Amino acid sequence: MISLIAALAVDRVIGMENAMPWNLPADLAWFKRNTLNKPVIMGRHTWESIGRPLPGRKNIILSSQPGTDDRVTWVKSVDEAIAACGDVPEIMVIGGGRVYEQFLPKAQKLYLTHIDAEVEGDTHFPDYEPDDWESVFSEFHDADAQNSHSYCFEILERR
Ligand SMILES: NC(=O)c1ccc[n+]([C@@H]2O[C@H](COP(=O)([O-])OP(=O)(O)OC[C@H]3O[C@@H](n4cnc5c(N)ncnc54)[C@H](OP(=O)(O)O)[C@@H]3O)[C@@H](O)[C@H]2O)c1
Ligand SMILES: Nc1nc(=O)c2nc(CNc3ccc(C(=O)N[C@@H](CCC(=O)O)C(=O)O)cc3)cnc2[nH]1
């Protein structure tokens, strides 16, 4: 099964100038929990943003050009990226905006963190059709001394 995981600020903003304009340790811990020991597919810009491999995950990078780091796997299309995952129970697509748009139709599951932050952005999560999805998990957290925004972890399943 293909899943998308992403954290969205207001207006579905997910990035600005190739970075995520917030700092939420608890959301990065959620990302790690829900991705460790699964393949992760990302676009080249997200690869550059993260800046290093995510350990304990097969990292698959989409790029039209030859790869530039053999610590990760490089592929040139959506279907090649899926194939490179092999026979696994769940493939995690970890962005960015352009990659999320292409995997959305194939995805059966969304793991979305809805962060209460106002962020100028230049990259968005897709404007997906809400009627396609049923929320099956939802957990809101107030801001605290480590996490400067409130946020809500939600899992949605394709109806
Ligand atoms: N908040 C979150 O949850 C979250 C998650 C991930 C990323 N982000 C943010 O999102 C931003 C990056 O997103 P982005 O939309 O600019 O870029 P992206 O989706 O990460 O990367 C796009 C790149 O991937 C390659 N690619 C995409 N689809 C392909 C295909 N079908 N075949 C071959 N190559 C393909 C291309 O590389 P080539 O140009 O080499 O062909 C392309 O330029 C950054 O700000 C980042 O911090 C936020
Ligand atoms: N919910 C969610 N939050 C995100 O921050 C997020 N980030 C990406 C892309 N960018 C990043 C940036 C950093 C790390 C990262 O440093 N995570 C480490 C440590 C996690 C922790 O500190 O607890 C990891 O091992 O996953 C992951 C993805 C994709 N989907 C997301 N989805």
Q: Which two tokens stand for residue 28?
A: 């990065």
Q: How far apart, in whole angstroms, are the C-alpha atoms of residue 109 and residue 1?
A: 8
Considering only CA atoms, which of 125, 153, 157 is closest in space to residue 141? Answer: 153
Q: What is the fold, at CATH topology level, of the domain defined by 1-159?
A: Dihydrofolate Reductase, subunit A (3.40.430)
- Rounded to the nearest 10°, the torsion over CA 83, 38, 89, 96 is -60
Q: How far apart, in whole angstroms, are the C-alpha atoms of residue 22 and residue 58?
A: 26
> In units of Å, what resolution does this entry have?
1.1
Domain positions in the chain: 1-159
Q: Which of 31, 36, 124 to mutate to test the pocket of ligand 2 (most atoms within 8 A of CB)?
A: 31
Please name the residue ranges forming H helices in the chain: 25-35, 44-50, 78-85, 97-103
Q: Which of 4, 14, 50 to mutate to test the pocket of ligand 1 (most atoms within 8 A of CB)?
A: 14
Q: What is the Cα 158 distance to its own chain's centre?
A: 17
Beta-bridged to residue 109, according to DSSP, are 3, 157
Query: Which single residue is written with the structure tokens 């090649």?
Result: 80
Query: Which single residue is written with the structure tokens 């793991």?
Result: 111
* CA distances, 63 to each of 41, 100, 121, 141 (Å): 11, 14, 23, 36
Q: How far apart, in whole angstroms, are the C-alpha atoms of residue 124 and residue 56?
A: 27
Q: CA-based Rg of the chain, rounded to a whole angstrom?
A: 15
Q: How far apart, in whole angstroms, are the C-alpha atoms of residue 42 and residue 95?
A: 5
Ligand 2 pocket (Cβ < 6 Å) reads 5-7, 20, 27-32, 46, 50, 54, 94-95, 113
Q: How was this structure determined?
A: X-ray
